Amino acid sequence: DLRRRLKYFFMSPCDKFRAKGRKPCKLMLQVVKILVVTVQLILFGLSNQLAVTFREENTIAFRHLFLLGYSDGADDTFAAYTREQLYQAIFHAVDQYLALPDVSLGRYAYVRGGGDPWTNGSGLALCQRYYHRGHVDPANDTFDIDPMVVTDCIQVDPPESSYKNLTLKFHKLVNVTIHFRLKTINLQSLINNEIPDCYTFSVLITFDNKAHSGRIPISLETQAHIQECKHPSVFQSFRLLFDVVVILTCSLSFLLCARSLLRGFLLQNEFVGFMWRLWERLEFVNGWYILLVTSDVLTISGTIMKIGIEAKNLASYDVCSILLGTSTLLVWVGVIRYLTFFHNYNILIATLRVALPSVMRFCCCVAVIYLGYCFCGWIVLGPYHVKFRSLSMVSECLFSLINGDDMFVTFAAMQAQQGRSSLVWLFSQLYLYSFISLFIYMVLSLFIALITGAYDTIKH
Amino acid sequence: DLRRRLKYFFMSPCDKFRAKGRKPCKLMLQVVKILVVTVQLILFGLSNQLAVTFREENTIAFRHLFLLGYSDGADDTFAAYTREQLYQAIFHAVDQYLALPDVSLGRYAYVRGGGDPWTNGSGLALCQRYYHRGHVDPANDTFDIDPMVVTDCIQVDPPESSYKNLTLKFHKLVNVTIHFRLKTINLQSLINNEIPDCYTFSVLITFDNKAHSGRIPISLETQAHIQECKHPSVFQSFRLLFDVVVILTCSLSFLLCARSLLRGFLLQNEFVGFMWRLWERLEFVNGWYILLVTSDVLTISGTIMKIGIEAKNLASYDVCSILLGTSTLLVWVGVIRYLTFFHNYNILIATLRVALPSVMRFCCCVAVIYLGYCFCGWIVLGPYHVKFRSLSMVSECLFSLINGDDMFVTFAAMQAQQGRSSLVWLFSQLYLYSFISLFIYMVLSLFIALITGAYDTIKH
Amino acid sequence: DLRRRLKYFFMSPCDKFRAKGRKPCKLMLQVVKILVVTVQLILFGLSNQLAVTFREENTIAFRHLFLLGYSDGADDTFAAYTREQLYQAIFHAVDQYLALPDVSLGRYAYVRGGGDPWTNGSGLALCQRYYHRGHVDPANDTFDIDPMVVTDCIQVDPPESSYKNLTLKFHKLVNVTIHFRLKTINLQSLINNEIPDCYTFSVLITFDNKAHSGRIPISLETQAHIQECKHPSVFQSFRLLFDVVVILTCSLSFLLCARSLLRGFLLQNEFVGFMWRLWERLEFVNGWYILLVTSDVLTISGTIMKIGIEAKNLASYDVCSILLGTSTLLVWVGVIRYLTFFHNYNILIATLRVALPSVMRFCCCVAVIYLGYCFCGWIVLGPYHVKFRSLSMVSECLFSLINGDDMFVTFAAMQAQQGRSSLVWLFSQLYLYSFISLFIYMVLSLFIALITGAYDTIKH
Amino acid sequence: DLRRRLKYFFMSPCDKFRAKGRKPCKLMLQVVKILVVTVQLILFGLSNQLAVTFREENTIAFRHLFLLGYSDGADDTFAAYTREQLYQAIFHAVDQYLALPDVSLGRYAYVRGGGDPWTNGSGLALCQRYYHRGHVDPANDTFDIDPMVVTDCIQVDPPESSYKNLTLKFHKLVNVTIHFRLKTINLQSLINNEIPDCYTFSVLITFDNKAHSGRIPISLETQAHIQECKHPSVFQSFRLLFDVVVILTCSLSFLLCARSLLRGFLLQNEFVGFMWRLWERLEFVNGWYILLVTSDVLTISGTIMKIGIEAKNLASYDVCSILLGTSTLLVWVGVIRYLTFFHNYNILIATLRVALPSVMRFCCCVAVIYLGYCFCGWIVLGPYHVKFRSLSMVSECLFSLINGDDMFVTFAAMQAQQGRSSLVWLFSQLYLYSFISLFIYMVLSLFIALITGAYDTIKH
Numbered sequence A, B, C, D: 001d002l003r004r005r006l007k008y009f010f011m012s013p014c015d016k017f018r019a020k021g022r023k024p025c026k027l028m029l030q031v032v033k034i035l036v037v038t039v040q041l042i043l044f045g046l047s048n049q050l051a052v053t054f055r056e057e058n059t060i061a062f063r064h065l066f067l068l069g070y071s072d073g074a075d076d077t078f079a080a081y082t083r084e085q086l087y088q089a090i091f092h093a094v095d096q097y098l099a100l101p102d103v104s105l106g107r108y109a110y111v112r113g114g115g116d117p118w119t120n121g122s123g124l125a126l127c128q129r130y131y132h133r134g135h136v137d138p139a140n141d142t143f144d145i146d147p148m149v150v151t152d153c154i155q156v157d158p159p160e161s162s163y164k165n166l167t168l169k170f171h172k173l174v175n176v177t178i179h180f181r182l183k184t185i186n187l188q189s190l191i192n193n194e195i196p197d198c199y200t201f202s203v204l205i206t207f208d209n210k211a212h213s214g215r216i217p218i219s220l221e222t223q224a225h226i227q228e229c230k231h232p233s234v235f236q237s238f239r240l241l242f243d244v245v246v247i248l249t250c251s252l253s254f255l256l257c258a259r260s261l262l263r264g265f266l267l268q269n270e271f272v273g274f275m276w277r278l279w280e281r282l283e284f285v286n287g288w289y290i291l292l293v294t295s296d297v298l299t300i301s302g303t304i305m306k307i308g309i310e311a312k313n314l315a316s317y318d319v320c321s322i323l324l325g326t327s328t329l330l331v332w333v334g335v336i337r338y339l340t341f342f343h344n345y346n347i348l349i350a351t352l353r354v355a356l357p358s359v360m361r362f363c364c365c366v367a368v369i370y371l372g373y374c375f376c377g378w379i380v381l382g383p384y385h386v387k388f389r390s391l392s393m394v395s396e397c398l399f400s401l402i403n404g405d406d407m408f409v410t411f412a413a414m415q416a417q418q419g420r421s422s423l424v425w426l427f428s429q430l431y432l433y434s435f436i437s438l439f440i441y442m443v444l445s446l447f448i449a450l451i452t453g454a455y456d457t458i459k460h
């Protein structure tokens, strides 16, 4: 009565087909889903690459146009050190903004007004921020500071020199910023056969004095707002149709998997009832179907967001990419289920499955030692070692060391400071050698031993 | 009747010699083949190195001569950013072309005419390509584009300034190219005792505006056409003879191996016929002889191509090198057969052979997870990480991570973008840590376990 | 009588609670200790990061202000090679010191007098050191040297050119130094909500001729003396209270652990006495409590030093950081004790414990081979290889090689010297290949085997 | 009669002492030998470091003084590309040579005459080498060359401009060289308390045109001839005594070890004779004593060479360093013998010993595959990949790949050439992926398996 039903429920697709001759719709549906999801992700990535490259190339051009004495690879060290240098950089940026139409290799339009920091009819805002009251007398070890920040900002209209009278309050200066906007048209879209779209680049140039260290870093950042151009004309819809096909495939997969999960739950309820006459009742849950339902939800939501983005109604590229990428990862991981139907592959998959619990437990054991080392290295070596400045950076360095990467440079950075502090150098020697020896000779060896033991258990 | 024949067929060379005292011609033939094939490959590579160096040195000299403000290591970032910069670069290249006889350290001759892009009597072609109709008004978010490309190209005759009147259509410009040819004689051939040959370098300088990003990259490429000089004269054939010797050795090896394979097939047919009174019948096939026949074919074809190339009748160096290198690899791999005749080496070789099937199956299992990670990383991190821009690049990065290479720089690239997008940085942390942990603690451990299990099976 | 007491003594916390229902104060005390110690370390590190950054940024600004022709990344090669270059560098540094008020982006005050090398009223000391008697005649292979060093030093008062008359004794010059001090106020302290403190930077510029090689390296170092500003005023104590809480928690932990250790010792004495009617009697010692007592002592001492430092009465940041970091590492390592109470985690921890003795013995065996290789590589390759200049550097290089890091660059450095000395290049080939092969194929394999054997022993 | 003698012969030092109470002179002699040999090596290395640094610093100073437009890190790319550049470089070098007394920071004396290439009274030789007859007409694809090299060389006397009339035969130029010598005194010897010695630097500047590629590399090399200064005088022998002590210790060790080996041989002869009433008779040979005798010979010879060198009668630093380093390596490896006397260490050492034969056999099996890959990669990728230019470089790259080092850069170098040749890029993908997969997943796994099997054999 019930034993036959339970036996059918826990049977492989091939033997299920032999038993009842039903159509294996779900399996071919999953194959088609993998295909279409991968194709959609590839097309989306190819489309996004072009936009990313356009933005990056424009920003590099802006750095070469507006930053005085800029060269590639200098982003992290580009700074001013004298009052003359700072004035020259600021005035050069403003003059290049005013000369852009006659000098630039790109074609840019000016944007006026549109809220702060710009007044009406103003294209460029040159704003200096300094403390409301600042009296600093290091000679007398004295200071009187009101930390309230005051902004004083000059407005420059593009053509068709009040900024040259700028006077900086160096002793109380917090920062200087230059804000402007440039409109351009992405013609290289025609390479991919699309229609050009209209970009507005919001450019911010920052001269940062918040450290008050005598060194003022200079940076240029851009933010791109993309719109559909309002008058396209190119001499002489199969992308939304594919998105709809993807949505329908994922919807059908979700419905079939949900029906299977519901049937499994009903059978579990029947079994518990008949056994009245949780690790065991959760044996009725097909984890692969949980994974498939999750991937279907992620794909549908990401495809809706993609439709929005490609129509220019949305600009949340990161979230859409994360959803689509995670769903593609899950659907490809789901291919392991088909390999589990064959004995030779199932041996290896079962080995991994039976090893996983002890691997996780050993990871928990190793984590406390690893975290102790992280904290110690951060506190002791952070003042001296560039790779130990932040806790996340320390963790990345230690993790790379565990895997035998970037070891000699880590030792050499401390070598460069051996003469300064001998105690810190000796401590670094002990710290690095002990950590590496412990984690390579003993920890990774035990991971290998756990996997080998699981494999030997499976093979018998 | 037949059992004796089958026993003789499946016997080692030494015991075969004991049984019938026949001459082991094939074994010494294989030894000689390995020797001569390796010698030929070494000579060919030594000869190709000189030509490669000559071409590379000439091209570096051209970059220093013709690119304004060029310096070594700037190939990937060399670009123009202003109209003045572009004009200066173009005019500098043309002026250096015209001044070459009096300034260059090399000796070059001019080439005139000879088809497009050059007219008759013209040495240098300066061509600008722009859209047929281009109206771009980013101010009004408007554009009218006919994507048909128009080429307008100026011709410069070498001496024995109409180009100075060039006017670039910056808004519709697709690219600018400079084409010319230089003839030189490779005298350093005398270092290797050969006869100098005549090179024609086709030089192409590209100013690329296809991105329309305000940044125009500049590159110089060369193509070398090598000929026999028509009037050699050096004050005061044992290379083709060696090629013929190689061809004959490989032909004899091919014939002997083919005869052995035919005999094996005949014996298999006899055995099946007698067993009437495919994994078993393919046991009659000597795989080492399949490999030897393949290597003989590859060596003969590559040697024919090499004879053609060295006479200057062919220029397909890549295919010839691939054929000869693959054949040399195969003949060296064939030395394992001789080690299989000794018990202690055969133990290890048999271990590898019995492990291989499960290793391939586990590779198949690991491949789907790896590919899912590839797709996810490409879509999510490609906009932010230089190592994740293309799918092949993503695969290379992930493969290097599996083996503990370039890990910290991968983490640091994302560190550099933590402030921008926190969600993407957190995702990258999860992505990298999970991938590395999974593939190093569990996957490589299982490869080790598979090999160890195979070894323990062999030793019992 | 006694067996019950001994059984209670060697019981887990849960079963102890069942037996006597006593309060598990020590366990929750240890949890609280871990929490507060970690919080204190994080706060201390965040506070120290700001000061480190302030000092580093000021020093970089000084290098750009005072070193003629300095650029970032040139610290290790910055040098003078002509007499004119050296004079220009010295005079540029002094002129920039005199012009600092009108050119610097920072706000600095001059410091006068205050002991050597400065006289009263002098801000900058320009001192040249040369041998008392030096006659060097390489033409006649002759020299007469009195190695006693003479110091002649010019004093410059800051404003509100006797140094321009400096004449260097080039042939007998030992070095040149420029000493001065600058007072500044650390305003960026307000970012962390603290009160700005007063920094005195002692700047030393060295032109070093001790090698007498014709190349004089130039360096700039700073030493920061931090004080409480004597007239703070910022428009509109929960850090010392936390330190006191930490001290009290660690004191209570120390007392409870000491009481437990004393009770264990008394029980051991009773057991030996009753067994009259050291590896066994030390079984009565709880090693986790030894570790906890050590961590308590380190935390208390480090917290006292931290209280001193934050009040500006102490400047021993290195020792305080080492104490606090080591204590945090120990308290996090102590979490393993709680995992040992659960069978599945205890299996892995016990595996590590039983493997440790043989791991240490094998480390001892490997150490002599490693040290022999260190000495050989230092003596043979040190003259030619940058990574082999010092013994500690050699050890770092070899250790990185063992773990598969920085291998190809090590080979390439010797490749760059193959033409010079063929014998040394061949020796380096043998040396590197043999070391790497031995230590990767055999040594690490044996570490894996030891751990696997221990794991198999534990699982049975 | 004999069994007692054989039993005594094969006994440990402790049990030997119990049996006969003889003095263990050899063991303490070996301890003293290790100590003194290590001390000698350390002192020798510290002494050599100073001389190496002096030579390197002088050579860097020469590069900055004599090479026009030279900067650090440009050694490998420093070249001339125009006739004007080459003339300027040559004339700048000669002018700096003539101005050296008034410009250099070092103190140098001129050397005149003394054989070729200098005439009597000449300090600098400026020599150009070109073909005897050279007619190159690339326009007509014609050339008439007599490869005999003619040298024409101008002589410059130092002061107390015929070279300015140099005319270069650019079309037939082989190279240009500048030779001169400078005498200096190594004053920094006083830092180590030694006596300054007199250096003669032979400086060679080469402008190399042997490629005839239009790019002429420029290099500067030095050769240092060190002498004892003939008139030392420093205001106000325990190194040779230590060398004699080392020689005597090694002589005594050699004699005792030779006596033991002779006794072993005599006992073996007795045993074979009595067994009449080679793997077994070589069991009578103590391999540790063979090693000790070798190390004694190497140490004595190296110490003799060191005595010669330090007296300035010899200049063979490389051979002496190799001898002393190898001997120190051997004496430190000999410490394993003492660990073999203890069971727990002997287990691990015996594991390594019993694994070694199969490890060597597997290395032999792996070598043919590795060499096939080396040849294939050299021939196919050498034209395109910098890491594959020479066979030794290919081997170093592949060995580094086996150990997971420098993998991503190897892939990226080929990425940079994907557009050029797609066939070569695909081949490189297959080549690299297959090599790395094979050698990491299967070969290293089998090394681990061999060691684990040996360990399990030893433990039972």
Ligand SMILES: CCCCCCCC(=O)OC[C@H](COP(=O)(O)O[C@@H]1[C@H](O)[C@H](OP(=O)(O)O)[C@@H](O)[C@H](OP(=O)(O)O)[C@H]1O)OC(=O)CCCCCCC
Binding pocket: A009, A016, A020, A022, A023, A024, A025, A026, A027, A255, A256, A259, A260
């Ligand atoms: C009255 C119906 C009410 C429910 C409505 C929804 C019905 C619906 O989704 O059925 C899914 C199946 C295929 O679903 P599919 O997954 O291909 O097949 C099922 C699975 O193999 C399942 O095993 P697991 O996958 O391991 O859980 C098994 O237990 C079911 O048998 P069982 O029923 O005897 O237990 C199968 O029917 O059938 C269609 O797909 C109908 C196509 C119709 C024509 C389409 C247009 C031409």
Ligand SMILES: CCCCCCCC(=O)OC[C@H](COP(=O)(O)O[C@@H]1[C@H](O)[C@H](OP(=O)(O)O)[C@@H](O)[C@H](OP(=O)(O)O)[C@H]1O)OC(=O)CCCCCCC
Binding pocket: B009, B016, B020, B022, B023, B024, B025, B026, B027, B255, B256, B259, B260
């Ligand atoms: C009538 C003949 C028609 C066929 C013509 C071609 C004949 C031809 O290739 O024979 C190859 C053998 C050597 O060939 P070689 O490979 O050295 O030797 C054979 C292999 O050992 C083979 O074993 P596998 O290699 O394991 O398959 C074995 O079965 C054969 O014995 P079997 O015949 O009893 O079965 C051997 O003869 O003999 C010559 O090489 C003759 C030299 C002649 C003189 C050369 C100039 C001085």
Ligand SMILES: CCCCCCCC(=O)OC[C@H](COP(=O)(O)O[C@@H]1[C@H](O)[C@H](OP(=O)(O)O)[C@@H](O)[C@H](OP(=O)(O)O)[C@H]1O)OC(=O)CCCCCCC
Binding pocket: C009, C016, C020, C022, C023, C024, C025, C026, C027, C255, C256, C259, C260
């Ligand atoms: C007359 C007393 C003289 C000694 C004075 C110091 C007394 C002192 O430290 O006791 C520690 C314990 C808790 O200490 P705590 O560590 O939580 O608990 C002890 C441990 O569990 C110990 O095992 P191990 O940790 O494995 O060694 C066990 O043997 C002891 O039982 P036993 O005594 O039967 O052998 C327990 O009492 O009790 C308080 O903490 C009192 C709180 C009082 C109220 C506080 C304010 C509200």
Ligand SMILES: CCCCCCCC(=O)OC[C@H](COP(=O)(O)O[C@@H]1[C@H](O)[C@H](OP(=O)(O)O)[C@@H](O)[C@H](OP(=O)(O)O)[C@H]1O)OC(=O)CCCCCCC
Binding pocket: D009, D016, D020, D022, D023, D024, D025, D026, D027, D255, D256, D259, D260
């Ligand atoms: C008539 C003698 C002719 C031969 C002359 C040379 C004699 C010479 O080298 O003896 C070495 C031994 C110490 O040598 P040493 O190595 O310390 O000791 C020997 C080893 O232990 C050897 O074992 P292995 O090392 O395993 O082979 C063992 O067989 C010998 O016993 P056996 O003789 O019963 O077989 C020992 O004598 O004795 C001195 O060192 C004498 C010191 C004298 C005083 C020095 C100044 C105060």
Ligand SMILES: CCCCCCCCCC
Binding pocket: A285, A286, A287, A288, A291, A333
């Ligand atoms: C039948 C249930 C077994 C678990 C399948 C889900 C595995 C997901 C891997 C991420």
Ligand SMILES: CCCCCCCCCC
Binding pocket: B285, B286, B287, B288, B291, B333
């Ligand atoms: C006797 C047949 C066994 C297989 C030999 C071929 C192996 C080729 C390795 C690439």
